[PDB]
Design a protein around this ligand. Structure first.
Ligand SMILES: O=C(NO)[C@H](NC(=O)[C@H]1[C@H]2C[C@@H]3C[C@@H](C[C@H]1C3)C2)c1ccc(-c2cc(F)c(F)c(F)c2)cc1
Ligand SMILES: O=C(NO)[C@H](NC(=O)[C@H]1[C@H]2C[C@@H]3C[C@@H](C[C@H]1C3)C2)c1ccc(-c2cc(F)c(F)c(F)c2)cc1
Ligand SMILES: O=C(NO)[C@H](NC(=O)[C@H]1[C@H]2C[C@@H]3C[C@@H](C[C@H]1C3)C2)c1ccc(-c2cc(F)c(F)c(F)c2)cc1
Ligand SMILES: [Zn+2]
Ligand SMILES: [Zn+2]
Ligand SMILES: [Zn+2]
Lengths: 518, 511, 510
């Protein structure tokens, strides 16, 4: 519980925003068939033009205002085209003699927007909300989207609109006003109304994960992060337990404890639980890799391109799981019991650190020969998986920033899923589809398993010959799941949004949809 | 004050020689218009030959010994030339029928800059090595102004002196100089000897390895220097640094076994104080790189005891100024001393740390630690209420590629200050070149999360980016920044130069 | 003059656009007193807010349109801030029920913009231009600007607006500027349009890939340009170069399939010649590094079509000079053009070669080919009997570490000349900084076997060592050297800068 400091200026907790400006936006959804009122703030039309690439803008909604309708006639709109991401602002006086702002965002010629397409549309919208003080935004859907796409639109709008300023001091943004109101006009509005607060919930789970991830390693360390988890748990009425180093010792988690040996922060193992009232038909363990900083240890990340300064991101898995805990504990699904786990620690260089060559002992009794101290994540997951399976659960799913190789196999958009069970793997892919968080199935190639045979220990931690690191790491983890359906989601390549210089909070929505659809 | 040790064999202070053999040299300046008495020791003529390529050696000076006069005849010296750096030894018997020794050092054709003179002195010094002599006599047959004559002496003393503090397993006693208008030059002699020691003192600290020279022992050394000079002094410990909120500077020091010690000396003139100056020195006693470990080929980790050269320069200057006692000024000598190490307690890449002026900083690379310590030292300096702040630092390796090993670079926010630094470079004979603070690059220091980024992810002109970083930590005071990373260590001679002591003292005195 | 080909599909000329849509834009300058008219197209106000960082937009100019005035009233514009480069533009109906777009570009909180600042402002302007179909841009200056900064604005606007599409498989026709004391600025317009093209032309040669822009085709371009400007011209081939004994220059080109070509254009004033000037551009069409191959990571071998950026700057200046026709001057535009390649015929590390002035040189690294070609170009320049020799060259990577991508370095043996280059830098708004030639380093070029070393094996101040090497080939003439290795390529925008054209022209003109 008590956070150790080297000097008194050292942070003793992670600053966390719960009540964001997003939560104070009133959202009303109207059915477009009754005509739009254009009275104030900024009103934006989402417009496409099927078949005609960069075709003209034609506004098809009924607008309950003559002056605004006059302005929006197709003769006046013909000069503008629907090229995806394009936008324009208009200015005019409505019938009540009040100035209003109107505009549109282009959605292209394909009548079916992908997640990536919709993200580009939301990002254009957000540029319109920035550097303009508005009290209200109104969005008019003149494209077709299903309920899942509609929620994704909101989540993405909320997340991208919110600005993280916890660590600004003298350099706040002086003109950062937020709208207080969001209006939405859409066909068959009644069926979309329920997606609003779900979106609001999914947004905060993501944003919450994002806050933890972006929080630097001095602020976010194993004690302060496990402290953050308790506090979250206390707010959602989840059972929680935090296992300290001595409880970890009696459980014999030598693989996990070895990784943390060189840190000034004691290892902390997070265990949150949500249980439905009534009959529990499904028991699930979600495991998140929680390395608050990864220097590589004695295999120091010193090589060019190793990006040691990003390595605060190595607890993204853990963050996704705690954000999932927020969503699950908030939306309170039935017929399920979910354990939220994370073996939280820091991989450091010290006289106390574990060394390359060290043979260590996992809690299932297997000896492991460390080949590289920078493959610390799989060692922590090993003990966490053994703990997970001892809970007697139906599914074990881990999510982790595990291997750099993901950048070379799938890149920055798709996470890879590996697993020992096809039904479980298809359930993740379905959740991938409905969370709109992209995932691709990659194989566990058993032919490589023999390169993990250690001459002295039971098993090698790393291969000395296979370069398919993401696959080898999956093989190693499989060795610690005895007889349970298990899946592994590697998010090393997708966790961090390099272009925006911020986390994505990737996985929160994937994991929650997974829980809900079960 | 107490120096922590890991083993009982770890040193608890820096050995420092205050009274050097150079100090035991009696110096006499004579007018050459009165003739030379070549009787004892070794007598050397500094000869030129204006314009005439590698002209012959011509002895212009009058010599009060008939015998030597015969030897030094124009006929005898014609087979010798005046090539810059060349030398010959002469042996003879004088009018007294006593054995004497004579020779010359060639000074070339051009009637000499700093770099020229050095090669002259290194030739002289070679003659003083591997020959036991009780006195050296030097006859000028070249023309030097007063600043250049002092440079000759400073450089002679510095290169002659040999640092033996770390060895375990015959200096001359008199220096005679023959020069025209000798009376104008005499005043320069003890000024040179002071400048020599402030320089050699800076060299001692720098050359002292990091197990001898740590934040505690260096700051004890500063106190000991203050007490001997009767300077006022205050050493800030971790508790007061915490109270002063020096979060940037304390972050760098987190990983070390030696507590941070902030050095603050003050010289104040009696009478009316007209100019208040803060001199700030980078004082990293060892730079491992931290978690951005200096492990790349060419990063030269074994050199990094030198990373407190700025502090050395400032303390060296304190000796000079405390000795020469100028009027009308108050000088604050500052250095945020710490060690940058790898430890469970070290600061990490990515960390967000808060400076004493309230500014949050995203750390991009733990090896850019110099500018973090300077940030809080600069906030401190400006709070003193001064007119000028000059910092000097082994800040960026890029200096080697811009100016190389000869010229330091100065940056600043004030043209008048920069000119004064440049004018001081001229009279101190420590070359500096003015480099621009290019504001176009400032946008890359914008952090997504913190008030400011420590480093740029896209601009390769490191010296300028660092200068832009420091500028954020001076609000409304004339400031300049001397980057001595390239010029501080002499790779040829394998020793410090003590670069900047003379430069900063000339700046102080001239104001 | 005939371009050799490996296969029949290899290009044999560099495509050039001489007539550009910028040349068809009608530019009018109006005084701000009297009020602004807002009748069509896009009207942009350039606005700052002194002292108030990210402070609100305030429009002070009278606008002779009641609808647009309403839009520009204080209570509506303060919704926006003046943060440098920030923009907003809106479509509305004006008094005549005509659709006009009105907006602004934030010019920050500083009352006198720098060249980098103005560039950020223009980029924000061009974004709106590229994103709207427009017949007219009207720009209203509510910020302070001197004649040279006004011209620099137009120049940059034209350059950044222009899109180079030669290698791919609707611009405005009117530009209106409102500004106080409009009459003092009007003369800058056609000057800007000429400076723009010299820069754009230089841009075209640089961007042209090495299979397109080779020594033979680049010299052909220069002939074509000189013919269009009635400049005298002479292209030296290998036979003449051999007779002139240009051994350093020829050695660099040995490995290429393209023969060396030496460009020599000359402008002469109608009246008496009072000043003779030689401009010497480095012209390596492609630098593979030679046997010291650019294989090290970060050496950016795919960029090395830019290694003729100096020659390009020289030829753009020739366009400007031949067009504006300075008086009392004679100017020689020179470039020793070749290609540094790997082959059985290449020169080798360790080779000792003989420059045209008799100095033997020990090659230490074949990727230091630029100073080799410049040595013979400088000798050739001095044999002309000129008053100033000024060279411009992508010479040393180290410039990225000293000045970066914004400022070029200038080195020289003469302080009058350097202060002229410096002054030219100020009036052209092409930022340059004076760097020293440190003589203490000269000894590292003392070869054991040859007269001189091409490189130092010890000193790391490369841009200074190269300056020292080039100094050896200029005996008694005022000379300056502008290293543009760092500043020549706009990495952010993925295109050339045409850097140096305007700087060399201002030097020639003023
Ligand atoms: O340190 C790691 N996990 O704790 C992990 N290391 C690996 O994937 C490789 C490394 C370390 C090992 C030995 C061998 C195969 C495996 C294990 C090379 C890893 C994970 C992410 C990244 C990574 C690096 C980036 F630059 C980046 F932009 C990113 F998104 C991820 C790099 C290495
Ligand atoms: O450690 C330094 N300051 O505390 C400094 N480092 C840098 O300039 C690099 C480091 C820290 C930065 C981020 C990135 C680029 C820049 C700035 C790596 C630095 C200073 C001197 C030297 C240096 C190295 C030599 F081999 C040498 F001979 C010398 F004289 C100086 C190298 C790096
Ligand atoms: O090849 C060159 N000129 O023909 C030049 N080369 C060098 O400066 C190297 C060559 C020649 C020298 C000795 C040693 C180090 C230095 C100086 C190898 C040079 C010029 C531009 C660049 C360069 C590289 C970049 F990646 C880049 F973005 C840029 F703008 C310039 C790199 C090297
Ligand atoms: Zn790792
Ligand atoms: Zn460092
Ligand atoms: Zn080259």
């Amino acid at each position: 519980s008590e956070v150790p400091q080297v000097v008194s200026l050292d942070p003793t907790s992670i600053p966390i925003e719960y009540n964001t400006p997003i939560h104070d936006i009133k959202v009303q959804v109207y059915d477009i068939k009754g005509g739009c009122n254009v009275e104030e703030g900024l009103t934006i039309f989402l417009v496409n033009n099927p078949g005609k690439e960069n075709g003209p803008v034609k506004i098809s909604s009924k607008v309950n205002d003559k002056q605004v309708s006059e302005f929006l006639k197709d003769e006046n709109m013909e000069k503008f085209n629907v090229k995806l991401g394009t936008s324009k602002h208009f200015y005019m006086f409505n019938d009540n003699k009040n100035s209003v702002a109107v505009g549109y965002v282009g959605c292209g010629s394909v009548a079916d927007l992908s997640e990536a397409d919709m993200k580009r549309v939301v990002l254009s919208l957000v540029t319109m909300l920035h550097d303009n003080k508005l009290s209200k935004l109104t969005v008019v859907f003149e494209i077709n989207v299903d309920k899942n796409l509609f929620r994704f639109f909101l989540e993405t709008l909320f997340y991208e609109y919110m600005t993280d300023e916890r660590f600004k001091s003298t350099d706040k943004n002086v003109n950062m006003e937020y709208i207080k109101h969001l209006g939405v006009y859409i066909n068959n509005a009644d069926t979309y109304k329920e997606e609003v607060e779900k979106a609001r919930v999914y947004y905060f789970g993501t944003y919450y994960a994002s806050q933890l991830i972006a929080a630097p390693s001095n602020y976010c360390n194993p004690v302060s992060l496990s402290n953050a988890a308790v506090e979250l748990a206390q707010k959602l009425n989840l059972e929680y337990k935090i296992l300290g180093v001595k409880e970890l010792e009696e459980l014999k988690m030598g693989a996990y404890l070895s990784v943390g040996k060189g840190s000034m922060y004691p290892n902390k193992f997070i265990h949150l639980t949500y249980k439905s009232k009534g009959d529990v038909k499904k028991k699930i363990a979600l495991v998140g890799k929680g390395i608050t900083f990864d220097s590589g240890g004695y295999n120091l990340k010193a090589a060019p391109g190793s990006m040691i300064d990003l390595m605060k991101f190595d607890m993204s898995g853990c963050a996704a799981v705690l954000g999932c805990a927020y969503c699950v504990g908030t939306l309170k699904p039935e017929n399920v019991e979910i354990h939220f786990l994370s073996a939280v620690c820091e991989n450091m260089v010290s006289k106390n650190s574990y060394r390359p060559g060290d043979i260590i002992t996992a809690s299932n009794g297997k000896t492991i020969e460390v080949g590289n101290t920078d493959a610390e994540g799989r060692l922590t997951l090993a003990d966490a998986l053994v703990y997970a399976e001892k809970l007697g659960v139906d599914y074990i799913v881990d999510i982790a920033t595990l291997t750099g190789a993901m950048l070379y196999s799938l890149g920055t958009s798709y996470a890879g899923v590996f697993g020992n069970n096809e039904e479980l793997i298809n359930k993740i892919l379905q959740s991938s589809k409905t969370s709109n968080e992209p995932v691709w199935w990659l194989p566990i190639i058993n032919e490589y398993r023999a390169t993990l045979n250690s001459k002295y220990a039971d098993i090698n931690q790393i291969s000395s010959s296979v370069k398919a690191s993401s696959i080898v790491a999956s093989l190693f983890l499989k060795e610690f799941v005895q007889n349970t359906a298990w899946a592994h989601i590697d998010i090393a390549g997708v966790s961090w949004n390099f272009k925006a210089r911020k986390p994505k909070g990737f996985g929160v929505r994937l994991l929650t949809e997974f829980v809900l659809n079960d």
